[PDB]
Amino acid sequence: EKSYCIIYQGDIESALQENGINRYMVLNSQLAVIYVPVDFDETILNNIIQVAWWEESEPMSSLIEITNNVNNGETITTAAETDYIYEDITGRGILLAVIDSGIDYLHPDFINDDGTSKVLYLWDQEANTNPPPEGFIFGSEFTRSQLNIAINRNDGSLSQDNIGTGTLVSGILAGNGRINSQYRGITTESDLIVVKLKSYTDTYYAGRINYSVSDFLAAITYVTNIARTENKPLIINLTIGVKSSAVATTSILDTFNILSSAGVVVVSGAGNQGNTDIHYSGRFSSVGEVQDVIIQDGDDYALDITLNTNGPDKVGAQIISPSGEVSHDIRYSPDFYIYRGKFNLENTTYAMRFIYPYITSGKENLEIRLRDIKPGVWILRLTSELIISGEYDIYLPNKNLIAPDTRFLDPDSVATITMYAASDDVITVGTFNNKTDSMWIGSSKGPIRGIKPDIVASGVDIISTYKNGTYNTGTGTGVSSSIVTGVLALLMEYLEKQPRLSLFTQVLKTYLILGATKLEIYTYPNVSQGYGILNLKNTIQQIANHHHHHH
């Protein structure tokens, strides 16, 4: 099953059904997702008048690395600096969304003294034992009442977290320290809304697991539906991400009107591509110039390469195999042609085509798909056709989806933000390393053209709940974003106590930036640290007491 995101106008449901597209979900007034067989002819979508835009759903991967280092780890209390509060603010009345690998809801650290679950709602997109949530076409929805019975019966079968990152995230936000009190999370009275996303294996490299944009967008619809029903503020914590990009405009998440409402806040990790060499930056100085971009491939099965030209610049492209066989030398043409072929010695096939993603507003990007790729040096030969600045960017998939040795020969760590964290409509969090008193080497960096991340937070070897009633440690920007999510829940309750219609992302981001710690002699803001390090105590003092970072 592949899937597509669709921007529609009119009666899209009738139109899809008339075209034999029977598996779909309408997610908001503009956005639908469809699920179709592998043999599906995507050109169909151009001849459905109710379709305005369409894009194949791309892989997403975790922003957390599990590091098995509890003995030298840092507690959540230390990372979030929450002794200043707890040593009447608990996160009461705030909903927190975890969209990830699920949750081990039988972990004692998610069970209250009276035996009830800290999870309010759980949608397991893979399960088939309860009906899906209303308006969705797969998985099983569970409520706290059901989880409470499951806890009483020690029934862990409703939904399992087989990876552990969702459990790690949930513990940062809300673990109660039942097994080890030192390891408790940030909030005590916030409710969790958990979605376990459908998973896929071996997309590029054997043994690696990814998620898919379409399923993620459906999860966004579900958790915001719940927030609307419960009429409570909601923080959505993005601990997974698509591939990195240099674009800084809004994403397809901007189709959700609810994400522009008061009391609905999106926090994302910045990305974990700061040192993974999955980004190439280049610049043409003239038209007709040829530049060769060197890619080393490890033992990948497949690879997707995205080229973006950041402006009106037009660039042609050709793929060259380690043995010297070449692909079509493609140029801009006003058609949807997919150029295909085979590198005979390598037995590798390619598909190259221009893509029109929603985020670039009609500007084409170049997509190159290599299948059955073999190890060695691959060359992307680029020819400029029209330039103003001449600048361009190329991205490989996130490193945790591809072979360890797959990389650009000449990488650029700048402009490695994961794409959904690029927009100013999200609070974007990078990872500080308290052990080295510096940024984590893996933390993605903002672009120079255009500031991300907004702030950073401790996120190296953080101890949290893990599967099967254990503790483990995690590192990365999904850890840091979880720290900020939990602290923001405390800040939102503090603001409400001493109007909720004013708790917009922009307001909360301003307070986080005003309270952030700036280390001596560095220049701020910068594309590594943003405006500085999260500081709960100083942010409260700012809330209590021209000061805007753009004024």
Author numbering: 2 to 88, 93 to 455, 458 to 505, 509 to 555, 560 to 565
Task: Please quote the authors directly.
The major nosocomial pathogen Clostridioides difficile depends on spore germination to initiate infection. Interestingly, C. difficile’s germinant sensing mechanism differs markedly from other spore-forming bacteria, since it uses bile acids to induce germination and lacks the transmembrane germinant receptors conserved in almost all spore-forming organisms. Instead, C. difficile is thought to use CspC, a soluble pseudoprotease, to sense these unique bile acid germinants. While C. difficile strains encode homologs of all three Csp proteins, only CspB has an intact Asp, His, and Ser catalytic triad, since CspA and CspC carry mutations in two of the catalytic residues that render them pseudoproteases.
